[PDB]
Amino acid sequence: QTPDKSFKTDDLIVQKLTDHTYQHLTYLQTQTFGKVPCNGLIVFDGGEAVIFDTPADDATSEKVIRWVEDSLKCKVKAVIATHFHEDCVGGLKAFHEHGIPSYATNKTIAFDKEHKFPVPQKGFDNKLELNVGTKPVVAAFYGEGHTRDNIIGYFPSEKVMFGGCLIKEVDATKGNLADANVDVWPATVANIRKQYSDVKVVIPGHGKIGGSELLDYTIKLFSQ
Ligand SMILES: [Zn+2]
Ligand SMILES: [Zn+2]
């Protein structure tokens, strides 16, 4: 077993999901969408942690980093931006001030430079393999959808998937399609469903965490 260091505040929620994974949840205030909750993932083992998506800004990012060090007794080994939008890179500056390396695909990094968003520092094409303690962490591209660059995260030792905004909560609407390739989105998530057939936890970019049924739902939503 592992301790439960979950907690809730007005600007930040951290919630245990499995023995070695935690959801982080922050909020992004827009004038065209309003206040939207945003999900990320923390996985850890052996004093090392990896985080998928920054919390929405530098202040909540700072709180998460300190909590990983103080409560989990882990060093944040890396942060991975799962696409170029601000609910993935908004807090990158705080990670960088802590000397925490940030990773994203080269496509994501080009997008962030073009949009003058904070830029992940280390690029890769299609797939990144990290270790947390002795545990594998995967981040990989399976096709376009919510954006042309979106990737997912997987922690196979506990079958936890961070789907990001490519994956919708059950009964969600299509959401923000401004950068989307909707015609291939079903095939992209079908590809993911085919390759992660025993996933136990699926975390959408926004909304309620569930199981593999979030893949089936997302495929339906964009297939009609
Ligand atoms: Zn997005
Ligand atoms: Zn999003």
Automatic annotation (TrEMBL):
Its cofactor is Zn(2+). It comes from Dyadobacter fermentans (strain ATCC 700827 / DSM 18053 / CIP 107007 / KCTC 52180 / NS114). One of its GO terms (cellular component) is periplasmic space. Zn(2+) 1 binds at residues 83, 85, 87, 146. This is beta-lactamase. It catalyses: a beta-lactam + H2O = a substituted beta-amino acid. Residues 37-206 form the Metallo-beta-lactamase domain. Its EC number is 3.5.2.6. It comes from the Bacteria. Transmembrane segments: none annotated. It is found in: Periplasm. Zn(2+) 2 binds at residues 87, 165, 206. It holds the Pfam family Lactamase_B. Monomer.
